[PDB]
């Protein structure tokens, strides 16, 4: 089920790649080249952690619900997780 | 005859999980890079 | 990762991405037409109606009825609702399905949560719009259908009144939930949870019905009677009377229209050539009827009622004799008793342009649309245009007051769909405001 | 329409439409309406209302059908036959009942409510069986996550719970045809669950077996293992032997039936032996 | 608070004592300097000098340790680095 | 050192407990033996809170929003009030002999628990019920009532009560989860007060 | 339930509609004071610790316990009487 | 530099005033249900039973508290109901719920 | 001019406060209380530094364009600029 | 990165190297552990091992150093502890 949805998403002209990072920067599934797969997993792992800390620092009884970072080249979205999150990159243009 | 189709059968969550398991386990066994 | 207990996260992540992509897709004075006529499941169906929206000002719905000819050998329900957008590329976005003839269709005014329709046989249905695609029969070439509602066909009640419906409209009057009373056994707020607007349904008998139920915390199957989905029911009911002044002796209604400003007020028209006024809360405010400066009866069989989408509360209606009246709420008699061009034929559809000037559109039986712009001219049509592909079935004017646009979507008896944009008339805007005030003052 | 599709057969659709137009137009035009017309016109309303609620009941039933025909459970199929018997026997009564609406619809209101009630009960029972169905599914997805080399008890427990739940359903007065269909399909589901874990074991037998300890010394001044090398080889082979013999003694649901549904996996996955024995020899070399 | 060991080059018995000692020091003192001082002194006595201890909420370090005498762990949000060198 | 209303006479202003509002060092309530809670800022005083007339054994300051001030005594009834006007906000109607302790946590949403002179400890989720305990903690079959209740300020879900033996028992409670929306309880109480 | 909406219940229309509920409450109110009567009779002597009711003021004498004990009984019984009077409208149920 | 600060404010204003309103009522996916912790079961009981053994035989608990700093430190004090005006009646019993506090 | 546009934004039903962060996490203008004024300014300064670096790391020829953080309590949006960014907080409810 | 020395048991020339080394480390490296490592290694090379370096914004320490081989100073708001032991 989830694999079919990921394929359908990847087929969308906006989507530039999807990475499933599981064990804290260790992926299992990717639609991207290896150097980018590894770098992207690492960056988004560190990045989401920083956002979660920021929210807890603002209020000690709230965590992250969603995080989006945008750039000229592409846009990246992540969601909070218990064990692992999923990475999506799209071209906003 | 092995009937890998399993046509006279039905399940929703059991077959979905099995597909998931098949892929994850198969890739893991390849990664083991056993010389055997 | 091997466990479905974690794959649930993967599902949720996909659901978020899908919605974001769908949101990303919502991008952008004479004949300049466009077509969106893909036939993935419309190969044999005939157009019967059109309906526009208010939450998505670029959305339109189109009803289609399948003939006895089955383009697909599958069990194919003959009644579907085609949902698509003006700016999107060719191809319907969604589709809803039912078992019996569907009509009396409307949308939710606050957000796309529910879609409502009245059945030909008097029942009421509502589909869950805000639902992911799953547990629905899909097809290749992919496209997926959607069917999910618990109709009043199930648990028997009186609200059905076993009478065909004529019209439905969302009634945005929910002002309750002031507080949950401190003693919980007497708290009325609980039963209003999630209820942001009601839905009204008038039948031929002249009996008006209002109710709504909303609830999200659910699971695949319920102990109570329902579909096998997660959807609300129809436990709530209110009933209002009508035709007291009008009523062999048994009379009926033809059309109803509520007041956008205060949705508690409404008017009802009858075949006898009269339109009554009433409301919901205080039933003695102004129980008058509307009538032109005529005598006798003149049972013109009023068939279309609308409202001018502007400050002054003026209702409009047209009849089979090709006449239109402007029934100002604060008057028993209309302001401008215009007899439309080609009065030899009937009114087949009315609407007010979604534009700054008070432009009014009429369609007749000969498929010749006439337009008025009373802010700049007299009661004579300011424009008109007929079509060679005649036998029009429906139209709807769609636009948005700032980016802005203006369009008109139509459909023919042949089963084709059309649309064009003449936004040069979107607004002056300065001249329009000048004349708008002038017309109100004079 | 013995295709799970109920339909109302209205006889005098014309009379209704005519009379409705009749009185409406005569009133609007200021015309006299004869007594004959007003009597039948009021009657016609009665027929229209009753026809609609009959459609509603049929629609309700048809909805139930669409929910039920997706699993084809012999229980609900038999209950549905009993429902159809109500309609069929009621049809026979039409010799005297075909004019209830004409004279006094009240009997018909009771009629349709009783028929609807039977359908409602059917709908309720169906959802309850679906609840059971899900329960069994929840178990199977657990069962296909049991480690054959460590957790044999989990299969013993799981299988007993499956049988217990199935017997529990039967205790509610079910027909053998129902449980028959269930066990056949659910046995196949177990088959899938077991074969997967079976395949997993076959690939990692050299990794997941209980550890063996040996002492290395110089017996007679000659470097030798205690216990001897040939002995621990035999134990290692017996360990894998026990595993591969598992798909022979598996009392899956419907144990009264055949067992080959499971053991066929041995021949079908006989290729796995190559990897097993190759790894076995490599491990023995490592020890040497 | 909760003890979480991230790295250790140390026997199991000394690891537990390091945590236990820091836990008691954290219970008795609020000042990181004084917490560190307790931890260091106790280790010099029980496991011979010379130990060093750093306790804090925000730092990076690069140090050299004698084998079997280094641990890095958290007590809640406070990190404790303890090792022998010299 | 002096709160005395009509000094040098039948004026012996004794109290059994005092609670202070986290809002301000100079706001607190005195659990007078007379039974009527007295507001004091020390001596000045402003409100006498007539809804609770029995001799007070326990008081507690309001958690956040400074409107749910507790008094409880011989009445066996937990009367909340808002010092702003001293109206009867609500009275828990426990048909129990006495009350000996109350549990609040400003950290958590507006929730309530208390230990009663029967051995039971009641919990109340304001958004679910008023008079009906949601969760209730029991003693053994023949244990005499609990005489004290307190909760760790460092939440860590550590509640402690004391039995009629020299034993203190700790419970780990999960019911009081946080959520967005419970604030409604504050608006419901403010509206009840003003009507 | 009756206390909070007593102003409505006392209305002729509603009072009659709730007649069965008001009589049901009356019977329960009778049960209530019945239990209080027995509890008083079995404890009024003040001999066992339970009959007196331990208090922090016990250091003066048993008088403080009796005062509080009875105070509660009086308030409870008195309240039930007034509630029945307001709601029942002096039916035979109330007379008894 | 006030006009320089104003210029920046204009640029971001153009972005936020449009972006914010579009997002605020976007009414996007609302199925987010993440706990970050295993669901706790029904409330537990008898987590720990601290007391002075000998003294607890005759005394009863009347005052308890927790140390805000050392959250492990649970305090208790039992006493006799009578005679509290004259003699030493009891002790203050504390026990940690800390590492190695197995007793 | 800009003072009116900021008030205009503040008047929006979603907006719960605006902070104009200028001197490296120290704001100069605020429509909020003092504890929040410094709380958000400081935390978001640290975060945006991470976000901008994240973009440069994932691709060495791009800077930040925008960031959004969502939480159960509230939602915060920031955009990068040459000298300084601006913080706006909304109530998603 | 202004340097302020709070305490030292070190020659003036070694003090200068400490500041200069940390200054370069802070210019080159963004990450605390990497800054510390740079500083430590430069001292092992010039003044022989074994040096240890702690760099951070929030910590206390209690350490033992070889006589005349200790410095503790700030660069801006970041504290650097640099000493030899072993």
Swiss-Prot record, chains A, I:
CC annotations in GO: centrosome; ciliary tip; cilium; cytoplasm; cytoplasmic dynein complex; dynein complex; membrane; microtubule
Subcellular location: Cytoplasm, Cytoskeleton
GO-annotated molecular function: dynein intermediate chain binding; identical protein binding; microtubule motor activity
Superkingdom of this protein's organism: Eukaryota
Ubl conjugation keyword on record: no
Alphabetical list of Gene3D superfamilies matching this protein: Dynein light chain 2a, cytoplasmic (3.30.450.30)
Keywords: Acetylation, Cytoplasm, Cytoskeleton, Dynein, Microtubule, Motor protein, Transport
Any one GO biological process: visual behavior
Pfam families reported in the protein's UniProt record: Robl_LC7
Tissue: High expression in heart, liver, brain and pancreas; moderate in placenta, skeletal muscle and kidney; low in lung, prostate, testis, small intestine and colon. Isoform 1 expression is up-regulated in 64% hepatocellular carcinoma (HCC) patients.
Protein purpose: Acts as one of several non-catalytic accessory components of the cytoplasmic dynein 1 complex that are thought to be involved in linking dynein to cargos and to adapter proteins that regulate dynein function. Cytoplasmic dynein 1 acts as a motor for the intracellular retrograde motility of vesicles and organelles along microtubules.
Record PANTHER family: DYNEIN LIGHT CHAIN ROADBLOCK
Family: Belongs to the GAMAD family.
Protein name (record): Dynein light chain roadblock-type 1
Originating organism: Homo sapiens (Human)
From Swiss-Prot, chain B:
Superkingdom classification of source: Eukaryota
UniProt subcellular location: Golgi apparatus; Cytoplasm; Cell projection, Cilium; Cytoplasm, Cytoskeleton, Cilium basal body
Tissue: Expressed in bone, brain, kidney, and cartilage. Lower expression in heart, liver, lung, placenta and thymus.
Quaternary context: Light intermediate chain of the cytoplasmic dynein complex 2, a multisubunit complex composed at least of eleven different proteins. The cytoplasmic dynein 2 complex consists of two catalytic heavy chains (HCs) and a number of non-catalytic subunits presented by intermediate chains (ICs), light intermediate chains (LICs) and light chains (LCs).
Implicated disorder: Short-rib thoracic dysplasia 15 with polydactyly: A form of short-rib thoracic dysplasia, a group of autosomal recessive ciliopathies that are characterized by a constricted thoracic cage, short ribs, shortened tubular bones, and a 'trident' appearance of the acetabular roof. Polydactyly is variably present. Non-skeletal involvement can include cleft lip/palate as well as anomalies of major organs such as the brain, eye, heart, kidneys, liver, pancreas, intestines, and genitalia.
Family affiliation: Belongs to the dynein light intermediate chain family.
Name of the protein in its database record: Cytoplasmic dynein 2 light intermediate chain 1
Residues of the full protein shown: 308 to 343 of 351
Swiss-Prot record, chains E, J:
Keyword Ribonucleoprotein listed: no
Name of the protein in question: Dynein light chain 1, cytoplasmic
Organism: Homo sapiens
Sites of N6-acetyllysine modification: 33
Top-rank taxon: Eukaryota
Protein family (similarity comment): Belongs to the dynein light chain family.
Main location per the UniProt record: cytoplasm
Reported induction: Up-regulated by ATMIN, PAK1 and estrogen.
Swiss-Prot record, chain F:
Tissues/organs with expression: Expressed in several cell lines (at protein level).
A biological process term (GO) from this entry: cilium assembly
UniProt keywords, alphabetically: Cell projection, Ciliopathy, Cytoplasm, Cytoskeleton, Disease variant, Phosphoprotein, Repeat, WD repeat
Primary location group: cytoplasm
GO molecular function per UniProt: dynein heavy chain binding; dynein light chain binding
WD repeat placement: 51-91, 94-134, 141-181
Subcellular location: Cytoplasm; Cytoplasm, Cytoskeleton, Cilium basal body; Cytoplasm, Cytoskeleton, Cilium axoneme; Cytoplasm, Cytoskeleton, Microtubule organizing center, Centrosome
Function: Acts as one of several non-catalytic accessory components of the cytoplasmic dynein 2 complex (dynein-2 complex), a motor protein complex that drives the movement of cargos along microtubules within cilia and flagella in concert with the intraflagellar transport (IFT) system. DYNC2I2 plays a major role in retrograde ciliary protein trafficking and in ciliogenesis. Required also to maintain a functional transition zone.
Family according to the record: Belongs to the dynein light intermediate chain family.
Name of this chain's protein: Cytoplasmic dynein 2 intermediate chain 2
Residue window of the full protein shown: 309 to 534 of 536
């Amino acid at each position: 089920e989830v694999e079919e949805t990921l394929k359908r998403l990847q087929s969308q002209k906006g989507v530039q790649g999807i990475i499933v990072v599981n064990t804290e920067g260790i992926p299992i599934k990717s639609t991207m080249d290896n150097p980018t797969t590894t770098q992207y997993a690492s960056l988004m792992h560190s990045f989401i952690l920083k956002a979660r800390s920021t929210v807890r620092d603002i209020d000690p009884q709230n965590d992250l619900t969603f995080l989006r970072i945008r750039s000229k080249k592409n846009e990246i979205m992540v969601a909070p997780d218990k064990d692992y999150f999923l990475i999506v990159i799209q071209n906003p243009t | 005859i092995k009937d890998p189709a399993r046509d006279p059968q039905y399940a929703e969550n059991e077959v979905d999980e099995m597909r998931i398991q098949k892929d994850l386990e198969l890739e893991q066994y390849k990664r083991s890079s056993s010389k055997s | 990762i091997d466990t479905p207990r974690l794959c649930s996260f993967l599902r949720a992540a996909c659901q978020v991405m899908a919605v974001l992509l769908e949101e990303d897709r919502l991008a952008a004075s004479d004949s300049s037409s466009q077509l969106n006529t893909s036939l993935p499941f419309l190969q044999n169906r005939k157009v019967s109606s059109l309906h526009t929206s208010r939450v998505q000002r670029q959305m339109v719905v189109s009803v289609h009825d399948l003939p006895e000819k089955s383009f697909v050998p599958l069990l194919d329900s003959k009644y579907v609702l085609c949902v698509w957008d003006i700016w999107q590329p060719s191809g319907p976005q969604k589709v809803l399905i039912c078992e019996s003839q569907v009509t009396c269709c409307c949308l939710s005014p606050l957000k796309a949560f529910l879609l409502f329709a009245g059945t030909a046989h008097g029942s009421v249905v509502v589909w869950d719009l805000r639902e992911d695609s799953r547990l629905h029969y899909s097809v290749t070439l992919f496209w997926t259908f959607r069917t999910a509602t618990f109709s009043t066909d199930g648990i028997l009640t009186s609200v059905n009144h076993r009478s065909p419906l004529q019209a439905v409209e969302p009634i945005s009057t929910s002002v309750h939930k002031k507080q949950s009373f401190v003693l919980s056994p007497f708290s009325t707020q609980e039963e209003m949870s999630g209820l942001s607007f009601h839905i009204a349904s008038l039948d031929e008998s002249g009996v008006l019905n209002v109710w709504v139920v909303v609830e999200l915390p659910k699971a695949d199957i319920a102990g109570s009677i329902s579909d096998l989905g997660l959807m609300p029911g129809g436990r709530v009911k209110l009933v209002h009377s009508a035709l007291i002044q009008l009523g062999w002796g048994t009379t009926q209604t033809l059309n109803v229209k509520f007041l956008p400003s205060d949705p508690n007020h409404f008017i009802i028209g009858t075949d006898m050539g009269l339109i009554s006024h009433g409301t919901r809360q205080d039933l003695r405010v102004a129980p008058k009827l509307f009538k032109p400066q005529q005598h006798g009866i003149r049972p013109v069989k009023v068939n279309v009622i609308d409202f001018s989408p502007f400050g002054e509360p003026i209702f409009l209606a047209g009849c089979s004799d090709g006449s239109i009246r402007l029934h100002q709420l604060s008057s028993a008699f209309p302001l401008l008793q215009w007899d439309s061009s080609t009065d030899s034929h009937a009114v087949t559809g009315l609407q007010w342009s979604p534009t700054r000037p008070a432009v009014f559109l009429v369609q007749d039986d000969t498929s010749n649309i006439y337009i008025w712009d009373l802010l700049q001219s007299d009661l004579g049509p300011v424009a008109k245009q007929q079509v060679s592909p005649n036998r029009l079935v429906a139209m709807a004017a769609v636009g948005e007051p700032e980016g802005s646009f203006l369009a008109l979507v139509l459909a023919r008896a042949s089963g084709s769909i059309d649309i064009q944009h003449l936004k040069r008339r979107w607004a002056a805007p300065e001249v329009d405001e000048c004349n708008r005030l002038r017309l109100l003052l004079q | 329409l013995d295709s799970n599709d109920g339909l109302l057969k209205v006889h005098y659709s014309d009379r209704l439409v005519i009379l409705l137009r009749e009185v409406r137009q005569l009133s609007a035009l200021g015309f006299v309406i004869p007594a004959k017309i007003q009597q039948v016109a009021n009657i016609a309303q009665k027929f229209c209302k009753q026809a609609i609620i009959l459609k509603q009941v049929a629609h309700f039933y048809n909805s139930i059908d669409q929910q039920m025909i997706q699993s084809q459970r012999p229980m609900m199929l038999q209950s549905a036959l009993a429902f159809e018997q109500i309609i069929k026997n009621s049809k026979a009564g039409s010799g005297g009942k075909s004019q209830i609406t004409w004279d006094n619809p009240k009997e018909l209101e009771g009629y349709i409510q009783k028929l609807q009630n039977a359908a409602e009960r059917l709908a309720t029972e169906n959802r309850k069986l679906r609840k059971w169905h899900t329960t069994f599914c929840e178990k199977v997805v657990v069962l296909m996550n049991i480690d054959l080399l460590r957790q044999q008890q989990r299969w013993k427990d799981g299988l007993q719970e499956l049988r217990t739940g199935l017997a529990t359903v039967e205790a509610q007065g079910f027909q053998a045809s129902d449980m028959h269909a269930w066990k056949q399909h659910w046995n196949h589901q177990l088959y899938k669950a077991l074969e997967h874990q079976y395949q997993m074991g076959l690939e990692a037998l050299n990794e997941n077996l209980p550890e063996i300890n040996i002492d290395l010394t110089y017996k007679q001044g000659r470097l030798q293992f205690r216990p001897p090398f040939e002995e621990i080889r035999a134990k290692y082979y017996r360990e894998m032997k026990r595993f591969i013999g598992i798909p022979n003694q598996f009392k899956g649901v419907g144990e009264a039936g055949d067992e080959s549904i499971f053991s066929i996996m041995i021949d079908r996955n006989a290729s796995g032996f190559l990897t097993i024995f190759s790894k076995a020899e490599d491990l023995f070399r490592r020890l040497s | 608070r909760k003890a979480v060991i991230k790295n250790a080059d140390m026997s199991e018995e000394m690891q537990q004592d390091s945590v236990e000692c820091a836990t008691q020091a954290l219970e008795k003192y609020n000042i990181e300097k004084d917490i560190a001082a307790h931890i260091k002194k106790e280790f010099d006595k029980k496991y011979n000098p010379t130990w060093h201890c750093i306790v804090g909420r925000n730092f990076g370090s690069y140090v050299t340790h004698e084998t079997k005498h280094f641990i890095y762990f958290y007590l809640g949000q406070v990190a404790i680095l303890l090792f022998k060198s010299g | 050192t002096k709160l005395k209303k009509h000094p040098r006479g039948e004026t012996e202003v004794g109290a059994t407990a005092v609670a202070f509002s986290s809002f301000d060092p100079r706001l607190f309530i005195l659990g007078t033996e007379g039974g009527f809670p007295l507001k004091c800022s020390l001596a000045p005083a402003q409100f006498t809170f007539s809804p609770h007339g029995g001799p007070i054994y326990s008081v507690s300051c309001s958690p956040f929003h400074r409107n749910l001030f507790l008094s409880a005594g011989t009445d066996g009834h937990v009367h909340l009030y808002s010092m702003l006007q001293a109206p009867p906000l609500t009275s828990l109607q426990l048909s129990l002999k006495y009350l000996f302790a109350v549990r609040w946590s400003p950290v958590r949403p507006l929730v309530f628990a208390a230990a009663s002179g029967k051995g039971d400890v009641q919990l109340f989720d304001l958004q679910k019920s008023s008079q009906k305990p949601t969760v209730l903690i029991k003693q053994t079959q023949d244990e005499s009532p609990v005489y004290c209740l307190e909760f760790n300020s460092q939440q860590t879900q550590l509640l402690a009560a004391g039995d009629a033996q020299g034993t203190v028992k700790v419970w780990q409670l999960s019911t009081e989860f946080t959520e967005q929306g419970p604030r409604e309880a504050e608006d419901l109480d403010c509206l009840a007060a003003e009507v | 339930a009756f206390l909070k909406y007593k102003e409505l219940v006392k209305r002729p229309t509603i009072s009659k509609e709730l007649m069965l509920e008001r009589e049901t409450l009356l019977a329960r109110l009778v049960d209530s004071i019945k239990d209080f009567r027995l509890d008083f009779e079995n404890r009024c002597r003040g001999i066992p610790g339970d009959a007196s009711g331990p208090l922090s003021g016990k250091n003066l004498s048993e008088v403080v316990n009796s005062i509080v004990w009875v105070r509660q009984l009086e308030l409870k019984v008195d309240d039930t009487i007034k509630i029945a009077e307001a709601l029942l409208s002096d039916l035979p149920g109330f007379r008894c | 530099d006030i006009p320089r600060l104003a210029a920046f404010l204009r640029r971001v204003e153009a972005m936020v005033i449009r972006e914010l309103n579009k997002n605020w009522q976007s009414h996007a996916f609302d199925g987010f249900e993440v706990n970050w912790t295993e669901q706790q079961q029904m409330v537990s009981c008898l987590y720990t039973l601290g007391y002075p053994p000998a003294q607890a035989q005759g005394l009863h608990v009347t005052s308890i508290s927790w140390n805000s700093t050392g959250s492990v430190v649970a305090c208790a004090y039992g006493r006799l109901d009578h005679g509290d005006w004259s003699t030493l009646k009891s002790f203050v019993c504390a026990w940690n719920l800390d590492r190695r506090d197995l007793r």
